[PDB]
């Protein structure tokens, strides 16, 4: 399904961040990294690199680099009236029996 | 934020973009080397040009980082390989002149065809024609004529180009903070910053030399033996005190003596062990060799290969359509893609080639966890050493017995052992003195202790005490004879084969002494030995992270350059060649007068 012969440069990849994240935190930021002590003063070339780079997926990869689709389910246990419950089911009823 | 903290981020970003561009260039190289097509030619041009521009641009970005404040050794090595200026230190016109000199030397060597004999219609080719007609012949005069013709028509065209080539290389290496271009080639095997295991560039100058003084007698004995078997077929031209002319050394340049096996048989009644009939009997096609090879490799303990290797690698003939190259290559494209480019033939040498060419793949997949610049050997000699010890592990008759391609009633005796050792000494020992001579010659020409006025008289008097052969024709200064090799006319290092042999024998003795094997060293095998496989993967995994000076004793136990494993491999051959060479004089000397 994924990966292209011409290169799947559509799903990108964040390598650089000024600090580690927090659980269930999404960071939508392509802002510049400051490797040098000198300010970049906008989009600059030396010691100012973008933190987002493209995967570039192709069908002809190995196991360790092939595109894998991942779905993560997380259950919460809040002290609230539960809205999702299991499909508990019944059997056929009986007549005039103890 | 110090220079190292920003340097590791720059290195990681470089590693990601460089592995992307390396995958692009390597897939281009694969689909050209499996399909000769002009669209793949323009793919060559675009991929190579963009990779060169990217490397130059990132090298200019990497030059601003000082290499003295950084403490982490991997960052040191990767930024040191990044800060190689290369040809960019020159002037633009000087760099263009040197690149055109290299390209036209490559085209002269590739297109050099002899047209001297008889009328100029008969122009015999170099690669399929000349090596074949010198490998199997019985005429002294034709060999002398072909030698003189090739050497003249290459040297007369290459000598002033070689002058400009040598001086440009010397001045650019003097401009790259080094002392010599020979020093630049010796800088490949460089280890600095490590206490206890320290190394240097010019150390390579002595690194072979003393060890060659420990390998000089045994080769001499082999040398004596071959002249003892080469005055039978060549009468009135050969003298034991003076040995024999250099055009009789198998190939064009004395690189291989494997072409003298038929004329230097140990004993002619029993042929060598062959398995071509046994392979063709049961129809072992093109893939069954690979399946049994990977079964043997996982019996060592090495991990399995991916499905992306089997469906993608070209494992048979290229066919009438889809022209390609029939050269053994172990292609590492990058992101988990491993391929073997080879044209499969029903041959024992094909089996050895296949084992040698996924030995490189099994070395490649181990340092894949290392970053992009550490995806190589810590020295250039580990790759072919690993491939050839994998080939030698499959070359034992015990492995052929266990693999099912041998009659179980067949037994091994001393004659088969000495025949195999004599055949292998035509392969191992054949390259080593030529390697040491040519590397030392190039080092001392580039250094400046050989003046411009004389290059070849010192070559002939210097060949006599190492290689020990006569000049076939009395030779002046005008020609350019030692530049007529593929590894010299294309600017390639040649000490890699010496390092390969004398480290692969260390690896062989270490593995088959760690595998609890009893017997001589030529019978060592790695079937059903998981601990030796784990200790092999220990040094395969490291790559360029640890220095090779440190990585040498991780499997062997020693740090310095060794010849004792080669002595232990060749000790029965050494003893019976001491026994056999009794009525024939030993040693070479300049008593021959032409």
Swiss-Prot record, chain A:
Sequence segments annotated as region (Immunodominant HLA epitope recognized by the CD8+): 8-16
Outcome reported for the amino acid change (mutating residue 12 to Q): In strain: Omicron/BA.2.12.1
Effect of residue 79 to P: Increased resistance to human covalescent sera neutralization
Taxonomic classification: Viruses, Riboviria, Orthornavirae, Pisuviricota, Pisoniviricetes
Protein name according to UniProt: Spike protein S1
Region of interest (Disordered), residue spans: 15-50, 79-98
Effect caused by changing residue 43 to A: Increased resistance to neutralizing antibodies
Subunit structure: Binds to host ACE2. RBD also interacts with the N-linked glycan on 'Asn-90' of ACE2. Cleavage of S generates a polybasic C-terminal sequence on S1 that binds to host Neuropilin-1 (NRP1) and Neuropilin-2 (NRP2) receptors. Interacts with host integrin alpha-5/beta-1 (ITGA5:ITGB1) and with ACE2 in complex with integrin alpha-5/beta-1 (ITGA5:ITGB1). May interact via cytoplasmic c-terminus with M protein. May interact (via N-terminus) with host bilirubin and biliverdin, thereby preventing antibody binding to the SARS-CoV-2 spike NTD via an allosteric mechanism.
Domain of life: Viruses
Role played: Attaches the virion to the cell membrane by interacting with host receptor, initiating the infection. The major receptor is host ACE2. When S2/S2' has been cleaved, binding to the receptor triggers direct fusion at the cell membrane. When S2/S2' has not been cleaved, binding to the receptor results in internalization of the virus by endocytosis using host TFRC and GRM2 and leading to fusion of the virion membrane with the host endosomal membrane. Alternatively, may use NRP1/NRP2 and integrin as entry receptors.
Disulfide bonds: 40-48
UniProt-annotated stretches for the region Receptor-binding motif: 1-68
Result, substituting residue 53 to Y: Reduced host ACE2-binding affinity in vitro
Mutagenesis / variant outcome for changing residue 35 to V: Increased resistance to neutralizing antibodies
Organism: Severe acute respiratory syndrome coronavirus 2
From Swiss-Prot, chain B:
Domain Peptidase M2: 1-589
Effect of residue 71 to P: Increases slightly the interaction with RBD domain of SARS-CoV-2 spike protein
Post-translational modification: N-glycosylation on Asn-72 may limit SARS infectivity. Proteolytic cleavage by ADAM17 generates a secreted form. Also cleaved by serine proteases: TMPRSS2, TMPRSS11D and HPN/TMPRSS1.
Phylogenetic classification of the source organism: Eukaryota, Metazoa, Chordata, Craniata, Vertebrata
One GO CC term on file: membrane raft
Gene Ontology BP terms: angiotensin maturation; angiotensin-mediated drinking behavior; blood vessel diameter maintenance; entry receptor-mediated virion attachment to host cell; maternal process involved in female pregnancy; membrane fusion; negative regulation of ERK1 and ERK2 cascade; negative regulation of smooth muscle cell proliferation
Catalysed reaction equations from the record: angiotensin II + H2O = angiotensin-(1-7) + L-phenylalanine; angiotensin I + H2O = angiotensin-(1-9) + L-leucine; bradykinin(1-8) + H2O = bradykinin(1-7) + L-phenylalanine; neurotensin + H2O = neurotensin-(1-12) + L-leucine
Annotated consequence of substituting residue 333 to F: Increases slightly the interaction with RBD domain of SARS-CoV-2 spike protein
Taxonomic source organism: Homo sapiens
pH sensitivity of activity: Optimum pH is 6.5 in the presence of 1 M NaCl. Active from pH 6 to 9.
Impact upon substituting residue 19 to A: No effect on interaction with SARS-CoV spike glycoprotein
Protein's name according to its UniProt entry: Angiotensin-converting enzyme 2
Resulting phenotype, residue 16 to A: Increases slightly the interaction with RBD domain of SARS-CoV-2 spike protein
Keyword Metal-binding part of the UniProt annotation: yes
């Amino acid at each position: 399904l994924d990966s292209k012969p011409s290169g799947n440069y559509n799903y990108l990849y964040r390598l650089f961040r000024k600090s580690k994240l927090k659980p269930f935190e999404r960071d939508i930021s392509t802002e510049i990294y400051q490797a040098g002590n000198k300010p970049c003063n906008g989009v600059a070339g030396p010691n100012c690199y973008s933190p987002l780079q493209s995967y570039g997926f192709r069908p002809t990869y190995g196991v360790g680099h092939q595109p894998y689709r991942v779905v993560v389910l997380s259950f919460e246990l809040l002290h609230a009236p539960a809205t999702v419950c299991g499909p508990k089911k019944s059997t056929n009823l009986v007549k005039n029996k103890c | 934020s110090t220079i190292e903290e920003q340097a590791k981020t720059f290195l990681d970003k470089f590693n990601h973009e460089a592995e992307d561009l390396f995958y692009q260039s390597s897939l281009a190289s694969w689909n050209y080397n499996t399909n000769i097509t002009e669209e793949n030619v323009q793919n060559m041009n675009n991929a190579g040009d963009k990779w060169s521009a990217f490397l130059k641009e990132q090298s200019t970005l990497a030059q601003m980082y000082p290499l003295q404040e950084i403490q982490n050794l991997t960052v040191k090595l990767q930024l040191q390989a990044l800060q190689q200026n290369g040809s960019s230190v020159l002037s633009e016109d000087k760099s263009k002149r040197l690149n055109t000199i290299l390209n036209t030397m490559s085209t002269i060597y590739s297109t050099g065809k002899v047209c001297n004999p008889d009328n100029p219609q008969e122009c015999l080719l170099l690669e399929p024609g000349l090596n074949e007609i010198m490998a199997n012949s019985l005429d002294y005069n034709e060999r002398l004529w072909a030698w003189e013709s090739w050497r003249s028509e290459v040297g007369k065209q290459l000598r002033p180009l070689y002058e400009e080539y040598v001086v440009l290389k010397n001045e650019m290496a003097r401009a790259n903070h080094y002392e010599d271009y020979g020093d630049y080639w010796r800088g490949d095997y460089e280890v600095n910053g490590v206490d206890g295991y320290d190394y240097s560039r010019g150390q390579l100058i002595e690194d072979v030399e003393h060890t060659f003084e420990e390998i000089k007698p045994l080769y001499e004995h082999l040398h004596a033996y071959v002249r003892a078997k080469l005055m039978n077929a060549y009468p009135s031209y050969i003298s034991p005190i003076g040995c024999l002319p250099a055009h009789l050394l198998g190939d064009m340049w004395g690189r291989f003596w494997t072409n003298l096996y038929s004329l230097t048989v140990p004993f002619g009644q029993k042929p060598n062990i062959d398995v071509t009939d046994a392979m063709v009997d049961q129809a072992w096609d093109a893939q069954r060799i690979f399946k049994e090879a990977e079964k043997f490799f996982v019996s060592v303990g090495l991990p399995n290969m991916t499905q992306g290797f089997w469906e993608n690698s070209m494992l048979t003939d290229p066919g009438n359509v889809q022209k390609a190259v029939c050269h053994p290559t172990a292609w590492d494209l990058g992101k988990g893609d491993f391929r073997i480019l080879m044209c499969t033939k029903v041959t024992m040498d094909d089996f050895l080639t296949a084992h040698h060419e996924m030995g490189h793949i099994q070395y490649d997949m181990a340092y894949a966890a290392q970053p992009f610049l550490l995806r190589n050997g810590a020295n250039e000699g580990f790759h072919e050493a690993v491939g050839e010890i994998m080939s030698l592990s499959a070359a034992t008759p015990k492995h052929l017995k266990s693999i099912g391609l041998l009659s179980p009633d067949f037994q091994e005796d001393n004659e088969t052992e000495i025949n195999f050792l004599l055949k292998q000494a035509l392969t191992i020992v054949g390259t080593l003195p030529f390697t040491y001579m040519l590397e030392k010659w190039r080092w001392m020409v580039f250094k400046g202790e050989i003046p411009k006025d004389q290059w070849m008289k010192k070559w002939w008097e210097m060949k006599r005490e190492i290689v020990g052969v006569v000049e076939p024709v009395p030779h002046d200064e005008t020609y350019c004879d030692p530049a007529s090799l593929f590894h010299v006319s294309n600017d390639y290092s040649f000490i890699r084969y010496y390092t390969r042999t004398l480290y692969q024998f260390q690896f062989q003795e270490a593995l088959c002494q760690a595998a609890k094997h009893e017997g001589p060293l030529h019978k060592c095998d790695i079937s059903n030995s998981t601990e030796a496989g784990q200790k092999l993967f220990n040094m395969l995994r490291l790559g360029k992270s640890e220095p090779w000076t440190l990585a040498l004793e991780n499997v062997v136990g020693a740090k310095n350059m060794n010849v004792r494993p080669l002595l232990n491999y060749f000790e029965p051959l050494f003893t019976w060649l001491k026994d056999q060479n009794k009525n024939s004089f030993v040693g070479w000397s300049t008593d021959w007068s032409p």
